Amino acid sequence: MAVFHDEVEIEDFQYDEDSETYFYPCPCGDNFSITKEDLENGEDVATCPSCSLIIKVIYDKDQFVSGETVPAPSANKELVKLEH
Distance CA 30, CA 48 (A): 7
CB of 84 to Zn ion, least distance (A): 11
Helix (H, G, I), strand (E, B) or coil at 30: coil
With binding defined as CB under 5 A, does residue 54 bind Zn ion? no
With binding defined as CB under 5 A, does residue 65 bind Zn ion? no
26 is in an annotated binding site: yes
Type and span of the H or E element at 39 = helix 36-41
With binding defined as CB under 5 A, does residue 46 bind Zn ion? no
**Residues interacting with Zn ion, by CB under 5 A?**
26, 28, 48, 51
